[PDB]
Write a protein that binds this DNA or RNA. Structure first.
Lengths: 145, 63, 209, 124
RNA sequence: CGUAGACGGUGAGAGCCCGGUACGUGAAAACCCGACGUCUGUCUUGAUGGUGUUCCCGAGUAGCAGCGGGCCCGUGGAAUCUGCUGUGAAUCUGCCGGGACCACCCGGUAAGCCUGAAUACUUCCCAGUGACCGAUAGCGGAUUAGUACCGUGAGGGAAUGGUGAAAAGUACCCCGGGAGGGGAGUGAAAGAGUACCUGAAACCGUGCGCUUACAAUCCGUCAGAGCCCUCGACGUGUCGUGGGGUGAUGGCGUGCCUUUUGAAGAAUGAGCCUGCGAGUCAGGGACAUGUCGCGAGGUUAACCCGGGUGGGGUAGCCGCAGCGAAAGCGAGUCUGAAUAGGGCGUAUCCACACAAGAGUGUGUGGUGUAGUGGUGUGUUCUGGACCCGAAGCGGAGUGA
RNA sequence: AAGUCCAAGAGUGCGGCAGUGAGACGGCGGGGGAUAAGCUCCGUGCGUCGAGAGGGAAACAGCCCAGAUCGCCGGCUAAG
RNA sequence: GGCAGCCAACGUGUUGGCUGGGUAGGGGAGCGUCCUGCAUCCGGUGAAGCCGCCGAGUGAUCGAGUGGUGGAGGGUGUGG
């Protein structure tokens, strides 16, 4: 039987903490910090660059705005529609979420990246031109709702 | 305490699909008269941040 | 199919229970079980261990003496760490050692421990612990002796069997747990696991569901 | 988990003081001052283990040369002659013969003189 | 024996000797929490539902400015909320709020109120807990403790535990004035004597062995006579695969740490010993790696139920499709009147072709892309952030 | 094109972690100085010290020989 | 003659070739402390501690080898 005295960690799972500042044999004295300086007693911040204009100030701010109202779609490709539904059939947002192709509460859009070979009655907030075309070509229907 | 993101870096750098950090070039805001359009185009758009600054830019963007 | 015979206190097998392979036939993962039990014991550990830093120890607000001229080391407080009676630099502070181990990891560790026991034939089932009504440690000890000669025994008993709980409670190496609280550390610590039929059925139902 | 630095601390102290048993003054009594002398003690031990070979070879050479002069031959011509004769007796055992068995050393001196070139100073 | 194997005590590890424990029982009184009646109010002095037309629907108010405060919002295009100053409206075709204004449209009827629960804390009391401290620790305080002591004052602010199971703590001898001791006794032990468990080092003796008063010594190291002990042998006192002490003499030999180009350095620190004294911890933090779990999925936070780890918890988070500044489009997308090229993406890789040798492309066909939760470790973020150290700054007080 | 190639423990790229960013002297090429400085500032797939013990320069970081894994009371040599 | 790092060969870990000065620093593997899960073992027939003796390890260090004092808790394994 296995026991609490038989339980061990996995090989290489646990590593010995590095005891810095304990004798010269290990990381001793300066404790891996070297001799005098700022870094011998403090951590210099990430944004400081010696006093010259930092890279986060001498470079221009990226152009544009974020458009608070942007409507973004969780996308599923028709190749994934094929893989998830070899039998075809009705494929709504609920079906896609069940098969784990889109987030549960989101605006679903369908894109034609893979290839479609089965009759699918897909129903998503929007369809790319290629996705609609493939859905129709496979004998299915793409009801945008 | 959540690690706060550097606002300046967040506003001046971006990641692509693969994860490359991109930035716009300096020297395109003003004093554009004497700049030949070839220089202005060279400065136009985004380029990957140099490998040297990639580390600190990534640290500022993550936290 | 692991058919654990249900032995009554009287010494008569009353049916058998089938232990599902998914619950009592899992390949025991030692590293998983170790992480799970270590998380359990860390959760058990209350980090009620504190020390006063140099700002928490009493007094020491004033600079003990002049900065220069006294021929003595520069001290900024009689409560600095080097001072006898001063504050601890990096001493313990209260800590919450509990670890958020994933639910699947916890469940797999438990299923692995039960699987190990079932494989070794260390899982027994019973209709009752003593007889009912009045607890009897002598009767319960006699029955657990007739079942298993090992020392550590985990009695997974239902919440309603207060009789059996009390009867087996006072035996030295006999932990008592409920089927919903069945955990790695308990099963692994116990040499044998004795289920009341109701407890076994409840565990199997709750898990196969 | 407060650990006292006593069980562990005294082990190296007892070791260093036991090693320093025999030193003069503080170097045998105080762990800190014994440790300073123990560093030098083992530095010297290493240096002198490595220089003992050379200094014993020096002693052997001195004694072999003494016996060579007694036998009316120079030490370097003795070594040259022994090499020419193919006598692979090292200086340790040569000096042992010089001291214990001078007749054997005279025999080896005769061998080396015999194996020396007719003219040692000739270019050859 | 056990519905009691909790914990402690007892002359040393006690379920069974003791206090207790499981489990049972016990309030005269007082207090609290419940109900049960008097009692208190109200409704019944009534309930129903439909029509059309005047007054009412909180005023120094809302609103507007001038200056401010607050909000992510630092005055900004600055809404909403607010203080002080003025100016100051209408009552439903009213008025606000939708971050200024509308056929607008929605939210509805402010300028007067009271409102439990969910929530924060523990001076105090009770019962417990500790991979907390264990007398330089842990509270400053195991003892006298905020005491002694210091300061005029505010204020600062200590040190000091352990005989033994039981005091059995040396009735009466001796030396001494006493202290203290030697007897003798108690004690298992006095190698426990109220100076008391253990009794380290520093430090101070005494005894013994070697060695040193012709010698220039970082105090050692290597050779090493002599001397003094030990283990064997042979069984002569001398040799040994020996061991230990000392060290005549010879060789070599410039402390440790720090900080430096460089220190034995006549640069820093250290008189000595013992004890303590410095990369720690929190966070679904960030990055990277290890390792488990599950895997195109992975996890759940709060919270709920469990006298425990355990079970629930699908809100969210990260994956999952990119390009762009969005109408956005989407394995494409942005740029461009310009199918002109580039940017970034389409994991990766293999074969087929078409091409061009401008560094290789284009499609087509194959396998199908790997994250994400714990957790270890190293860095890191916010915190005191590895530890010590200023002069000084601020708030409130104390002092003529 | 070979060599080195059971290695230089090489070069390159991407990541984790750094330390360093006070150098010294010597040879050679130079600036400043007085073609002084143990001066100062450069270059040097130059060296050594730094961070390097050992031997030689008497002693003597930087000069010459030579790069200490340990033990031998073995041998041959380097500079000298 | 011993040890250690890389590499190869074949094996089921032996050999061989190279390589093992080192400060800042990086990586790897460990000794020791006490606190604990579990498992075992020692202890008033004398634990720890301390003082030695005789030794042991490539290091930190070790003696479930021993003697003196001692008087009650300790060791080992494996994890946290």
């Amino acid at each position: 039987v296995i026991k609490l005295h038989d339980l061990k960690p996995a090989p290489g799972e646990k590593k010995a903490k590095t005891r810095v500042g304990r004798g010269e044999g290990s990381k001793g004295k300066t404790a891996g910090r070297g001799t005098k300086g700022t870094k011998a007693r403090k951590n210099v911040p990430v944004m400081f660059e010696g006093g010259q204009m930092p890279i986060h100030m001498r470079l221009p701010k990226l152009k544009g705005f974020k458009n608070r109202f942007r409507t973004e779609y969780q996308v599923v490709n028709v190749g994934d529609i094929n893989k998830a539904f070899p039998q075809g059939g009705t494929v709504g947002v609920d079906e896609l979420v069940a098969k784990g192709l889109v987030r549960k509460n989101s605006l679903v859009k369908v894109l034609g990246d893979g290839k479609l070979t089965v009759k699918v009655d897909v129903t998503a907030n929007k369809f790319s031109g290629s996705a609609r075309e493939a859905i129709t070509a496979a004998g299915g229907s793409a009801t945008e709702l | 305490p959540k690690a706060k993101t550097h606002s300046g870096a967040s506003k001046r750098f971006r990641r692509t699909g693969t994860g490359k950090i991109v930035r716009q070039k300096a020297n395109r805001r003003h004093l554009l008269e004497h700049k030949p359009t070839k220089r202005t185009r060279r400065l136009d758009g985004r380029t990957t941040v140099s490998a040297a600054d990639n580390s600190r830019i990534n640290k500022l963007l993550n936290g | 199919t692991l058919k654990v015979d249900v032995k009554t206190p009287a010494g008569k097998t009353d049916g058998s229970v089938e232990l599902p392979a998914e619950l009592f036939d899992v390949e025991p993962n030692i590293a998983l079980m170790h992480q799970v039990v270590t998380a359990q014991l860390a959760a058990k550990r209350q980090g009620t261990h504190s020390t006063k830093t140099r700002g928490e120890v009493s007094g020491g607000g004033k600079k003990p003496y002049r900065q220069k001229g006294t021929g003595r080391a520069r001290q900024g407080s009689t409560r600095a760490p080097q001072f006898t009676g001063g504050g601890t630099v990096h001493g313990p502070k209260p800590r919450d050692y509990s670890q958020r181990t994933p639910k699947k990891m916890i469940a797999a560790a438990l299923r692995g421990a039960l699987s190990d026991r079932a494989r070794n034939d260390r899982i027994h089932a019973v209709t009752e612990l003593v007889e009912g009504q009045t607890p009897s440690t002598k009767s319960a000890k006699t029955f657990l002796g007739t079942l298993t000669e090992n020392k550590k025994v985990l009695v997974v008993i239902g919440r309603t069997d207060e009789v059996g709980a009390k009867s087996v409670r006072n035996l030295p190496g006999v932990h008592v747990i409920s089927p919903d609280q069945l955990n790695t550390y308990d099963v692994l610590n116990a040499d044998d696991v004795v289920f009341s039929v109701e407890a076994l059925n409840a565990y199997i139902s709750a898990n196969s569901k | 988990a407060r650990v006292k630095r006593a069980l562990n601390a005294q082990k190296k102290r007892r070791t260093v003081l036991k090693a320093s048993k025999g030193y003069r003054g503080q170097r045998s009594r105080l762990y800190r001052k014994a440790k300073e002398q123990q560093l030098h003690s083992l530095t010297y031990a290493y240096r002198d283990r490595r220089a003992r070979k050379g200094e014993f070879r020096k002693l052997w050479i001195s004694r072999i040369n003494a016996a060579a002069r007694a036998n009316d031959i120079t030490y370097n011509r003795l070594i040259q002659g022994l090499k020419a004769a193919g006598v692979e007796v090292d200086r340790k055992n040569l000096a042992e013969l010089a001291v214990s068995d001078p007749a054997a050393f005279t025999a080896l001196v005769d061998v080396a003189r015999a194996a020396l070139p007719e003219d040692v100073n000739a270019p050859s």
